[PDB]
Amino acid sequence: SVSSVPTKLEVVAATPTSLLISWDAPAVTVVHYVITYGETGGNSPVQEFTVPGSKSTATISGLKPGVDYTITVYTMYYSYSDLYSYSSPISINYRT
Amino acid sequence: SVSSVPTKLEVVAATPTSLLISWDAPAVTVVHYVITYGETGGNSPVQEFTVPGSKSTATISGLKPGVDYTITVYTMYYSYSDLYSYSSPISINYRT
Amino acid sequence: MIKSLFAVIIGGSVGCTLRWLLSTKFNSLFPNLPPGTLVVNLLAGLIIGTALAYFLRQPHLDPFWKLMITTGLCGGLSTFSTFSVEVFALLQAGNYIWALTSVLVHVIGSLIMTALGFFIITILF
Amino acid sequence: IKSLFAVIIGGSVGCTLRWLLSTKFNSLFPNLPPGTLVVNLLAGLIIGTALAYFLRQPHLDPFWKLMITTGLCGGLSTFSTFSVEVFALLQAGNYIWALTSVLVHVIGSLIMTALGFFIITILFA
Ligand SMILES: CCCCCCCCCCO[C@@H]1O[C@H](CO)[C@@H](O[C@H]2O[C@H](CO)[C@@H](O)[C@H](O)[C@H]2O)[C@H](O)[C@H]1O
Ligand SMILES: CCCCCCCCCCO[C@@H]1O[C@H](CO)[C@@H](O[C@H]2O[C@H](CO)[C@@H](O)[C@H](O)[C@H]2O)[C@H](O)[C@H]1O
Ligand SMILES: CCCCCCCCCCO[C@@H]1O[C@H](CO)[C@@H](O[C@H]2O[C@H](CO)[C@@H](O)[C@H](O)[C@H]2O)[C@H](O)[C@H]1O
Ligand SMILES: [Br-]
Ligand SMILES: [Br-]
Ligand code: NA
């Protein structure tokens, strides 16, 4: 009855080509966070990368200036009941 | 199944009033050895004492000169199947 | 030694199911060191320490119950594999301070629950 | 309830294994009973490999992960027996092997879990 999804995802610092995101870690043992980001406009390949579980911030670069991106985040965590499983995602939109 | 009883119980050095006995340890985690000594003719209080498992020799003292004594030694050992338990004894007789 | 086998199953089943119920209800409460897997290990440690100093005083008990309690219950109740994943996970997550702490508490606590159960019964008697 | 059978059938097999391996082998090296150890390394192995596998196949029935983890591994492994032995050695003034037994069980079981996990992880690549 304990959620593995992160909470309070927001952009704390931004540049024209990079977003800085922050999240509240779940009350689980997170092995790593998987960040996914893609241009909110249709068929721009969604790109993804991971962040260690001990961190709760991440940088995203290579973005075009003035574009709305969809930033989503989930976890690969350990629980007694499931071992290594992936959590549901938490998404936000931020426009550079 | 391995035996838990010592072997080669014997007086290695005697005086009139003391016996240096020794034995060989069984192939079991022996917590401590118990030595019992009394006058062979069932006419005297039987005395017992303990010696650490890390020792395989004991001293019997206060003996009467020229008297036959029955000396026996058993173990209190750990085995997987019986946890703690006492071994059957190994007895010898010796005249001081 | 088929009668011997039922002792392992009955005892273990209890110890397992017991371990299973406790871990689901309580493990999530404190993840840096799940308490469910710790209580069963302390519990079995407590039990086996008592079984130690009581079996000693009862040389003629049925090899049946001794099996069902130690190998069965305590064996099935306690766990070492589930102890390893939690540490392995705290290590993959770079949570060394807790991974190391989890190792210490389990080992020492289990030996104290053993020391307790042994010396409580040695002292009652 | 269906989950209950997994823990039982799983723990039963594991406990039955831990029993047979412990009786037949423990008595050969008292300083470090090897039956109580292999079951631990073997369960530590199984759980590590189970860890990495159920990740790659994230949608398989929860029944099989339960029977293998909390059952098999939980039943196969043991902490109480590891406790008594160490406590037995500690009681016997055998501090050297009491310590060694603690290390080899932990370090080894952890190495086995990492080994189980990392093999599978390297396999899927
Ligand atoms: C006694 C022996 C002790 C040493 C045991 C080995 C410890 C060091 C592992 C080095 O290899 C690692 O392999 C990981 C893959 O298995 C990679 O993880 C990457 O991918 C993982 C997911 O597969 C993520 O969780 C990680 O955060 C991400 O860094 C990681 O880069 C790489 O260095
Ligand atoms: C004494 C007993 C020994 C028994 C054997 C123990 C084996 C432990 C294996 C741990 O696995 C590795 O742990 C690293 C550390 O947690 C992870 O690094 C990940 O996390 C680090 C810190 O969070 C980051 O710096 C890395 O880049 C990132 O790959 C790495 O992925 C993971 O495979
Ligand atoms: C990491 C911590 C784990 C939790 C704590 C576990 C403690 C377990 C040991 C307690 O039992 C005592 O150990 C002593 C030492 O082995 C024994 O001394 C016995 O053996 C000694 C051997 O030197 C003799 O000197 C003593 O007189 C003799 O009583 C003593 O009988 C025994 O009751
Ligand atoms: Br497990
Ligand atoms: Br046990
Ligand atoms: Na177990």
Residue numbers in the entry:
A (entry chain C), B (entry chain D): 1 to 96
C (entry chain B): 1 to 125
D (entry chain A): 2 to 126
What's the paper's own text on this?
Microbes are protected from the cytoplasmic accumulation of environmental fluoride ion (F-) by export of the toxic anion via fluoride channels known as Flucs. These small, homodimeric ion channels are remarkable proteins in two regards: first, their unusual ‘dual-topology’ architecture, in which the two subunits of the homodimer are arranged antiparallel with respect to each other, yielding a double-barreled pair of pores related by twofold symmetry; second, the Flucs stand out among anion channels for their extreme substrate selectivity. The protein possesses two deep, aqueous vestibules with an electropositive character due to an absolutely conserved arginine sidechain and a deeply buried sodium ion at the center of the protein.
To test whether any of these densities might better be assigned as anions, we endeavored to crystallize Fluc channels with bromide (Br-), an anomalous scatterer. We were unable to generate diffracting Fluc-Bpe crystals in the presence of Br-, but we were successful in solving the structure of Fluc-Ec2 in the presence of 100 mM Br-. In planar lipid bilayers, I48C mediates robust fluoride currents, which rapidly diminish by ~50% upon addition of saturating MTSES to the cis chamber, consistent with full modification of a cis-facing thiol in a population of channels with oppositely oriented pores.
